[PDB]
Design an enzyme around this catalytic site. Structure first.
Site, PDB file in Angstrom:
ATOM      1  N   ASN B   9      40.503 -28.473  95.495  1.00  0.00           N
ATOM      2  CA  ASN B   9      41.412 -27.334  95.535  1.00  0.00           C
ATOM      3  C   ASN B   9      42.344 -27.458  96.742  1.00  0.00           C
ATOM      4  O   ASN B   9      41.919 -27.255  97.874  1.00  0.00           O
ATOM      5  CB  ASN B   9      40.597 -26.042  95.618  1.00  0.00           C
ATOM      6  CG  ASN B   9      41.464 -24.804  95.648  1.00  0.00           C
ATOM      7  OD1 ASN B   9      42.673 -24.885  95.470  1.00  0.00           O
ATOM      8  ND2 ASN B   9      40.846 -23.653  95.872  1.00  0.00           N
ATOM      9  N   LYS B  11      44.608 -25.591  97.600  1.00  0.00           N
ATOM     10  CA  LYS B  11      45.034 -24.253  98.012  1.00  0.00           C
ATOM     11  C   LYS B  11      46.548 -24.198  98.261  1.00  0.00           C
ATOM     12  O   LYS B  11      47.304 -24.830  97.535  1.00  0.00           O
ATOM     13  CB  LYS B  11      44.228 -23.760  99.213  1.00  0.00           C
ATOM     14  CG  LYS B  11      42.734 -23.822  98.947  1.00  0.00           C
ATOM     15  CD  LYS B  11      41.936 -23.009  99.958  1.00  0.00           C
ATOM     16  CE  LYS B  11      40.457 -23.068  99.614  1.00  0.00           C
ATOM     17  NZ  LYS B  11      39.617 -22.415 100.656  1.00  0.00           N
ATOM     18  N   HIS B  93      38.589 -17.472  91.845  1.00  0.00           N
ATOM     19  CA  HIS B  93      38.370 -18.013  93.175  1.00  0.00           C
ATOM     20  C   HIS B  93      38.188 -16.900  94.208  1.00  0.00           C
ATOM     21  O   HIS B  93      38.813 -15.834  94.118  1.00  0.00           O
ATOM     22  CB  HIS B  93      39.519 -18.917  93.602  1.00  0.00           C
ATOM     23  CG  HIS B  93      39.203 -19.711  94.830  1.00  0.00           C
ATOM     24  ND1 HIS B  93      39.442 -19.243  96.105  1.00  0.00           N
ATOM     25  CD2 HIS B  93      38.629 -20.929  94.976  1.00  0.00           C
ATOM     26  CE1 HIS B  93      39.040 -20.149  96.982  1.00  0.00           C
ATOM     27  NE2 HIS B  93      38.545 -21.181  96.320  1.00  0.00           N
ATOM     28  N   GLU B  95      39.358 -16.364  97.058  1.00  0.00           N
ATOM     29  CA  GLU B  95      40.573 -15.839  97.647  1.00  0.00           C
ATOM     30  C   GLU B  95      41.302 -14.886  96.696  1.00  0.00           C
ATOM     31  O   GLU B  95      41.901 -13.903  97.128  1.00  0.00           O
ATOM     32  CB  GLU B  95      41.466 -16.983  98.140  1.00  0.00           C
ATOM     33  CG  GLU B  95      40.875 -17.620  99.406  1.00  0.00           C
ATOM     34  CD  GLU B  95      41.009 -19.133  99.483  1.00  0.00           C
ATOM     35  OE1 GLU B  95      41.918 -19.688  98.838  1.00  0.00           O
ATOM     36  OE2 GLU B  95      40.189 -19.767 100.196  1.00  0.00           O
ATOM     37  N   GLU B 163      30.630 -20.313  95.114  1.00  0.00           N
ATOM     38  CA  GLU B 163      31.167 -20.264  96.472  1.00  0.00           C
ATOM     39  C   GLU B 163      30.318 -19.349  97.344  1.00  0.00           C
ATOM     40  O   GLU B 163      30.252 -18.147  97.104  1.00  0.00           O
ATOM     41  CB  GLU B 163      32.582 -19.702  96.467  1.00  0.00           C
ATOM     42  CG  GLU B 163      33.598 -20.439  95.635  1.00  0.00           C
ATOM     43  CD  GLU B 163      34.942 -19.758  95.743  1.00  0.00           C
ATOM     44  OE1 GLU B 163      35.656 -20.024  96.731  1.00  0.00           O
ATOM     45  OE2 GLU B 163      35.262 -18.927  94.869  1.00  0.00           O
ATOM     46  N   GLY B 169      33.827 -19.244 106.836  1.00  0.00           N
ATOM     47  CA  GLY B 169      34.686 -18.595 107.812  1.00  0.00           C
ATOM     48  C   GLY B 169      34.053 -17.381 108.462  1.00  0.00           C
ATOM     49  O   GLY B 169      34.734 -16.588 109.115  1.00  0.00           O
ATOM     50  N   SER B 209      31.142 -25.264 102.088  1.00  0.00           N
ATOM     51  CA  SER B 209      31.528 -26.345 102.986  1.00  0.00           C
ATOM     52  C   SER B 209      30.849 -27.643 102.580  1.00  0.00           C
ATOM     53  O   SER B 209      29.626 -27.705 102.440  1.00  0.00           O
ATOM     54  CB  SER B 209      31.159 -26.004 104.430  1.00  0.00           C
ATOM     55  OG  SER B 209      31.368 -27.122 105.276  1.00  0.00           O
TER      56      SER B 209
END
EC number: 5.3.1.1
Lengths: 246, 246
Positions: B9, B11, B93, B95, B163, B169, B209
């Site tokens: 991805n 992004k 996703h 995000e 995910e 993060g 990750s």
């Protein structure tokens, strides 16, 4: 005198076959020297459209995000838009405000970023039917315009587009005089809140229903400086609208 | 045996030059047999990437909308994605869900539409930190997976991507055992709620990750069938991850 501006918003319509044909038609059109023409293809086709379109026509993205790169799956940045040869982005379109819930604040940040990165911005505002009938047309469009203005340091590459959202599939339609009425109020807001100079120089284009049959009278309105065209932008009819003041 | 699946991805990162370089490196790489590699460029570059990428590597869009054409300024449809030569779309996703507020209902409707149109779908799920710490990991991912599943009529075209948003993060980190724990739970959910066939055959890839130093242990987990790689997908490290089973 403000230069006549005709933008075509292709929205989420078209494929390479149909858009190639449309682009052929537009390339064949003799675009008036006094008219600035911009086409906004679906995002997957910004690159395709810019490659195929004669340079006399500019390309716009239909939206962008507010940083140059990042973890924002599904977005594109002004940097990418410029990289694809496009020179404009449409921001704050009623569909993004209402279907996708983009806030005034977010739109403002997008405007600041797009301008900082060298793009022109077609910034859209407009009130819904409930708002117009509740009598707060001015409160609504003024607040939307204010948040945009809060993010414009230089108006040189900005065009304001008024969308009479209240006339989109609602059973109401705007007369040319009603368009003129709001355009004049918006220009007055620029004078009173920003400056006389900015009010005089900023194109305020009409984003309501415009077709070959109606474009001439709309273009004749003193505070109407052009169009953000919807469905007609995908048809040979778009050329009649380009010809609105000829 | 489930075919190992590695998705990159990109992004909202890159331009034609840098992505051209990325692509050259990918084209030059030797992809192991029985390894399915997919790249998801920024939307402006789907077309560009598909033109430059060796056909051995598939292209995915990073998002789409839920109808084929329409008044949705800024969106693209599965029809456009296919028209640009892409064969996948990433949906749901983290995000999209958490920055752009896409609801489970919307994601389900997108999945249904993309599949009806003959696109493959990489459907993403995952719990946030506040959810992980509240001990409701299963409740969250099961509910997300249920909405996806209710909108799938042919699982051969779907890949599920977990995910661990809680680790991404936040400062928290996910071990191979933690990933495996969730993947096994998801496969068990498919077995109980869809079918034994679908549970056995469906790739569930890890979207947390992943580095060159962690990918082999992650890929050795029984219920981990590959990766949806983020930032590392822009780097030569991606090739190492493609070779996780090697």
């Amino acid at each position: 005198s403000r230069k006549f501006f005709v933008g075509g918003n292709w929205k989420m319509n078209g494929r390479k076959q149909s858009l190639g044909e449309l682009i052929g038609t537009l390339n064949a059109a003799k675009v008036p020297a006094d008219t600035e023409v911009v086409c906004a293809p679906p995002t997957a086709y910004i690159d395709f459209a810019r490659q195929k379109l004669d340079p006399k026509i500019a390309v716009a993205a239909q939206n962008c995000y507010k940083v140059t790169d990042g973890a924002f799956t599904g977005e594109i940045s002004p940097g990418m838009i410029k990289d694809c040869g496009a020179t404009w982005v449409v921001l704050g379109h009623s569909e993004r405000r209402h279907v996708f819930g983009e806030s005034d604040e977010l739109i403002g940040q997008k405007v600041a970023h797009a301008l900082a990165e060298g793009l022109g911005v077609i910034a859209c505002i407009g009130e819904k039917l409930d708002e117009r009938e509740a009598g707060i047309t001015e409160k609504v469009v003024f607040e939307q315009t204010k948040v945009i203005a809060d993010n414009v340091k230089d108006w040189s590459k900005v065009v304001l587009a008024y969308e009479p959202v209240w006339a989109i599939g609602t059973g109401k339609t705007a007369t040319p005089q009603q368009a003129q009425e709001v355009h004049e109020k918006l220009r007055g807001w620029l004078k009173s809140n920003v400056s006389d100079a900015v009010a005089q120089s900023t194109r305020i284009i009409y984003g309501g229903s415009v077709t070959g049959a109606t474009c001439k009278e709309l273009a004749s309105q003193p505070d109407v400086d052009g169009f953000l065209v919807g469905g007609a932008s995908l048809k040979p009819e778009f050329v009649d609208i380009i010809n609105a003041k000829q």
